[PDB]
Amino acid sequence: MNINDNLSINSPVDNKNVVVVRARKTDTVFKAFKVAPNIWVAPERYYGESLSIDEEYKVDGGIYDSNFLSQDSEKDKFLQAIITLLKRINSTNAGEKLLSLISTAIPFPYGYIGGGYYAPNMITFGSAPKSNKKLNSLISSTIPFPYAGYRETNYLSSEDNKSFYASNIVIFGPGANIVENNTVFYKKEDAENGMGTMTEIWFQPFLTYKYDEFYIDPAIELIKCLIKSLYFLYGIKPSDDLVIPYRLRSELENIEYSQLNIVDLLVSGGIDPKFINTDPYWFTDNYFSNAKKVFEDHRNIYETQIEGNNAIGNDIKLRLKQKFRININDIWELNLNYFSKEFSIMMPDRFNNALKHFYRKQYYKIDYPENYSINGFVNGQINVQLSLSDRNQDIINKPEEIINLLNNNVSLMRSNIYGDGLKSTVDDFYSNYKIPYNRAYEYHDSSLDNVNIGVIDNIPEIIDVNPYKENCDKFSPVQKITSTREINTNIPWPINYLQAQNTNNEKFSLSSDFVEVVSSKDKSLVYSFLSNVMFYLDSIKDNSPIDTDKKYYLWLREIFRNYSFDITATQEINTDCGINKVVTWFGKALNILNTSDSFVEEFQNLGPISLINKKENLSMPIIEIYGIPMLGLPLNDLNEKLFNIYLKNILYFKKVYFNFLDQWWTEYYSQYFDLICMAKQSILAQEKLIKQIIQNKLQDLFKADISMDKLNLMNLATEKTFIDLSNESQIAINNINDFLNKSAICVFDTNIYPKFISFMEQCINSVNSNVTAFIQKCTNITEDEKLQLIKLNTFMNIDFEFFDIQSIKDLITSETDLIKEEKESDYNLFLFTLQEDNNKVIEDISGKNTLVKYSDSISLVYGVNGDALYLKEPDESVSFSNKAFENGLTNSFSICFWLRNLGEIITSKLIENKADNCGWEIYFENNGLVFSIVDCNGNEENIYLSDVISKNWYYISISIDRLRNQLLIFINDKLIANQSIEQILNIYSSNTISLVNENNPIYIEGLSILNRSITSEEVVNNYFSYLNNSYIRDISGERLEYNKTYELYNYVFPENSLYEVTENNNIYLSIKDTNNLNIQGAKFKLINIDANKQYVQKWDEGVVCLLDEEKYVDISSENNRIQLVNSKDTAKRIIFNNDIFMPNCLTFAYNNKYLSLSLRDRNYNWMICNNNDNIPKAAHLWALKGI
Amino acid sequence: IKLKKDSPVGEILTRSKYNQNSKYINYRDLYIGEKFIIRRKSNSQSIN
Structure with missing residues (x-):
């Protein structure tokens, strides 16, 4: 497979790759380009639909423009865009397999004109000349007369009707509706009988919409269209009357169900197809059986008549061989959920086929040379910078309902509700x-496993095509008219509340009285549920005007804090299904349970079912429980029969459980998803309101006597605060999603499952009675045998209880959710360092791709738990670049790393992000570090953190939380500072932070920058988990290693080094007395069986060596003290370990007994193998110090 | 994993599945492929 990317609209008509063909049997012709075998692209618009559509027949949400794709430039742009999309698809294995299957999956050819697919007739040609003796009349060549006589139905005809070109797919531009991707067939009859037919595709790649927080990649839409076409190619299209319920039209005041075709559900992917298509299958139709039977018949025909024939080209034969390699079940099981995982593309996953009703789309223009590449959207699917299209003003809007809220009978407001279509x-x-x-x-x-790309690529192309006379019937345009109802009411609907939060005036004002807002003649009010923000605004009202940038910074900080507190407000309540984080403000928005009191109070004294306005929608399915048929048989054989019946009944009881689950999804979860969509629309409205307020205030300030530099700084701070507000709103959206999903699941648990149990409880009796009757009707069995069998083949309630709360949770989780979880990170920089083989790599792996510039002079050593940057040479610098490092006014973050200083203690900068005065700094000063943070208004805050003496490992963790105005600094596993930064304004500094040495060599490890504040528990957990690495460390913190000279200390006495003392012609290790605390401490050495080993590990067994005669440690058998013997043979084999919560101190063990100190004995404290419990457990913890 | 017939590498094959009598049970064999074993490198710690 190779996509031809060397074509243009100006390409000559060569009748081989660029052709001018006829549209069906009409009088129009159009130009087509072949980009792959049997795949063509026609940039011009589709000929079928008429470009001029009466306003009555225009559909909702459609864009009509008869001048689009009329010029050649637009056509060439469309062709190049299609080629780029195809290349992007083929860049992945799944796309290549799909395209190869599309190319090879030719429609089945019709038989010879006479009939049959077996063999053609014979002819003779070329009679030899009359020889001297023999006439030689019969000496001639033999030919298959109708070679390649197979009549084909997949061909495009030239304008002259004297040439035909093979084609399976033809991608056209959009029809009458600019934004409507569609796939239509050539012959309806051939799309259902299993023969197959060519497909035509209408595609619009220049427009896309934003769902949630991401853009839609048109490649997914194209893949959906191609998969739908696959059905036509295989001729397995189901009847148009095979529909299934998709959503309950809750908004209507009537029992109306929306329906979707089976193909659309099976192809579109998402979560909807998961409730259908279960094991066992609860929904079935004759369509599947007929399709399988016809597919088997065609495969048998090919295998028994096509393969043997040697009078037909391989272009058709080899393609048909590969076409039937796959199975129909593979096609039915092929959906967008697989390609989403393969391509890592996010798409709508709930009711994605009826998004028109849920929310209105905004379309963005795509420039393909620039915004979209062979690797997808430039800068990703989230951060792509697109421009809103200018066609958004031409979107048709025909509501399905027009709510006219009244009041006595004066229409305060009029809202529109749109149908799914x-x-x-x-x-x-x-x-x-x-x-x-x-x-x-x-x-x-x-x-798609059975597809072999190489074989397809090896197929010769089709040159000569024998055409079927009648392969095109006609095209039937579909005309639709949208109705519109008027539902008058006096209780405001949620849509009215949502519309009350939008406005056009740029000088509006927030209000909390819905009636006051709607009754406003001036239209200067907007409804908002942000209590804190409005209260704060009213508080400052009638105060001094904002003139200084200090006042503006304080005002913006308070506004951001109040907005975040209000939007993210939650209240935890105890539900049967655990604990739910209810949203406090969900009542004021959407006008749900807003009668009085707290919304949470009503939600607790009333089930979650109360949220939705259409309950009790269940319906009992029809049940057909066939009775056991009869001939006698022995217990040995009858037992297997009864067991099979038992299993079949169990399966039927699931088929029913699954049917009830699908009913819940279609009728109950739809309303909760609608509530979710309405709720996340309110959040965006409030965000827009707050942003407009901030912009208005900034504009007012710009008309003041302030320097341009300060104004630019304020504008940048506002820009950053906008991102902060977006993050807060996204958190609120996540909370709403989780809360309402849990509410729906618990609604199923507490409102549907009991009814299913009740219904089956009335059906298990019938099955039991039938089984008992059949058993009693059998003669060849003992009475005790019959009683035992009845006791075995009877159903209790628990026999049909299939509820599994976790399965439901995993059933409403789509590939998009998994991708979002994988792509969710709290790190703006997570350093990763590897030494490799002389190919040292240092880079950020958080996904933010920070640009790191480091000199080659740097080195890498194993600091604590991995490679650590080692700055040794003077004037060594490391810089990390990222926009997020600019910080700002309203944003919380934190730095975390491990430091070791090998130098001294003059002042020396270590890490900084300062720009003149604004920013934050860290530097050694005195025998400790200093942390300095300074704003652009002169306010400073410098903290001195002591006890950072050299030759020690330290774990620095600094946090800045601007929601509480709290500064937390931890060292190791302790809290050093908890200062308040309420007076620290914008610290917008720069995009890069520099790390320098300045004559002091240093190890830096595990550098990390987080976009949020951290908790003490987090710091403690990280500190103690990082050091849990199976390595024993000295008091300094470096790995303990054998053959190194050390000094031994006891944790209880951290300033006394043990020394040898001779007593009773024996040498024991003791502690220095208070008076004689000047004697040099004894020096030790750790030996091991494997002398090659260097770094000590936990549980290692070794021998302690003490230095003239090379003494060794032995345990005295008379007093249990540790003595010294000049022989390694008599020395004990000690086991080394350590405590997790005391990382830098180790423990010795022998025979499962810890070595420890002993109580005072006339100015001595011996080292012993203790067993008494009167010695504190801290006395058996030792420390080794480098000597 | 199964040791290659000729090359000194391990080829990757697909696990077998239960296909004996029942459609109500399905599992994949586990006691197949090369039998691996972990041997202590240095034998420094106690062999107990």
Whole structure:
């Protein structure tokens, strides 16, 4: 497979790759370009739909422009965009396999004109000349007369009707509606009989919309269209009447169900297809059986008549061989969820086929040379910088309902509600569906495996095509008219509340009285539920005007703090399904349970079912429990029969459970998802209101006597605060999502499962009675045998209880959710250092791709738990670049790293991000560090952190939380400072932070920058988990190693070094007395069985060597003290370990007994093998200091 | 993993599945492939 990327609209008509063909049998012709075998691209708009559509027939959400794709430049841009999308798809294995399958999956060819697919007739040609003796009449060549006689139905005809070109797919531009991707067939009859037919695709790659917080990649839409076309190619299109319920139209005051075709659900992916397509299958139709039977028939025909024939080209034969290599189940199991995981593309996953009703789309223009590459969106799917399209003003809006809120009878407000646009059905579908018993009574990322790309690439192209005379029937445009109702009411609907939060005036004002807002003639009020923000605004009202940048900074900080506190407010309550984090403000917005008192109070004294306005929508499905048929048999054989019946009944009881689950999803979860969509629309409205307020205030300030530099700084601070507010709003959205999803699940648990249990409880009796009757009707069995069998083949309640709360949670989780979880990070910089093989790599792995510039002079050593930057040479610098490092006014962050200073203690800078005065700094000063933070208004805050003496490992963790105006600084695992930074304004400094040595060699390890404040528990956990690495360390913190000279200290006495003392012609280790505290301490050495080993590990067994005669440690058997013997043979084998919470101190063990000190004995404290419990447990912890 | 017939490398094969009698049970064999073993490198710590 190779996509031809060397074509342009100006390419000559060569009749081989660029052609001018006819549109079906009409009088129009169009130009087509072949970018791959049997795949063509036609940039011009689709010929079928008429460009001029009467306003009555225009559909909701559509964009109509008859001048689009009329000029050649637009056509060339469209063609290049299609080629780029195809290249992006083919860049991945899944896309290559899909495209190869599309190319090879030609429609089945019709038989010879006479009929059959077996063999052609024969002919003879070339009679030899009359020889001297023999006439030689019969000496001639033999030919298959109708070679390649197979009639084909996939061909485009030239304008002259004298040439035909093979084609399976033809990608056109959009039809009458600019934004409507569609896939249509060539012949309806051939798309359902299993023969197949060519497909035509309408695609619009220049427009996309934003869902949630990401943009939609058109490649996914193209893949969806291609998958839908695959059905047409294989001729397995189901009847248009095979629809299924998709969503309950809650907004209507009637029982109406929206319906979706099976193909659309199976192809579109998402979470909807997961409730259908279960094991066992609860939904079934004759379509699947007919398709499988026809596919098997065609495969048999190919295998018994096509392969043997030697009078037909391989262009068709080899393609058909690969076409039937795959199975129909593979196609049915192929959906967008697989490509989303393969391509790591986010897409809508809930009711993605009915998004028109949930929220209105805003379209953005895509420049393909620039915004989209073979690797997807430039700068990612989230950070791509696109521009809102100018066609958004031409979007058609035909509401399905027009709510006219009144009051006595004066219309205060008028809101519009839009439909899904899918086919509807008033008749109940669940109540009239029979879960079948004698069908699907078994079966209680591998779909495209059978495709072989290389073989497809080896296929010769089709040159000569024998055309089928009638392969095109006609095109039937679909005309639709959208209705519009008027539902008058006096109780405001949620949509009215949502619309009350939008405005056009730039000098509006927040208000909390909905009636006051709507009754406003001036239209100067906007409804908002932000209590704290409005209260603060009213507090400052009638105060001194804002003139100084200091006042503006304080005002903006307070506004941001109040907005975040209000939006993220939650209250935890105890529900049966654990604990739920309810949203306090969900009542004031959307006008739900807003009658009085706290919303949480009503939500607790009333089930979560109360949120939705349409309850009790269940319907009992039809049940067909066939009775056991009869001939006698022995207990040995009858037992297997009864066991099989038991299993079949269990499976049927699931088929029903699954049906009830699908009912819950379609009728109950739809309302909760609608509530989610309405709630996240309010958050964006409030964010827009706050941003407009801030912009208005900044504009007012700009008309003041202030320097340009300060104004630019204020503008940058506002820009950063906008990102901060966006982050807060996203947190609120996540909280809303989690809360409402949990509410829906617990609604299923507490409101539907009991009814399912009740219904089956009335059905298990029938099965039990039938089984008992059948058992009693059998003669060849003992009475005790019958009683035992009845006791075995009877169903209790617990026999049909399938509820699994975790399975439901994993059922409403889409690939998009997994991708978001994977892509969610709290680190703006997470250093990763590797030495490799003379190829040292230092880089950020948090995903923010910080530019790191380091000199080659740096080195890497194993500091604590990995490679650590080692700055030794003077004037060594390391710089990290990132926009987020600019900080600002309202943003909380934290630095965390491990430091070791090998120098002394003059002042010396270590890390800084200062720009003249603004920023933060760290530097050694005296025998400790100093942390300095300074704003652009002169306010400073310098803290001195003592006890940072050299030759020790320290764990620095600094946190700045601007929500509480709290500064936390930890060293090791202790809290040193808890100062307040309420007077610290904008610290906008720079995009790069420099790390320098300045004549002091240093190890720096595990540098990390977090975009949030940290807690003491987090610091303690990280500090103690980092050091849990199976290595024993000296008091300094460096790895303990064998053969190194050390000094031994006891944790209880951290200033006394043990020394040898001779007593009773024996040498024991004791502690220096208070008076004689000047004697030089004894020096030790650790030996090991494997002398090659250097670095000590936990549980290691070794021998302690003490230095003239090379003494060794032995344990006296008379007094239990530790003595010294001049022989390694008699020395004991000590085991080394350490405590997790005392990282730098180790423990000796022998025979599972810890060595420890002893109580005072006439100015001595011996080293002993203790067993008494009267010695404190801290006395058996030792420390080794480098000597 | 199965040791290669000729090359000194381990080829990767696909695990077997239960296909004996019942459609109600399905699992993949585990006691297949080369039998691996972990040997102490230095034998420094106690062998107990």
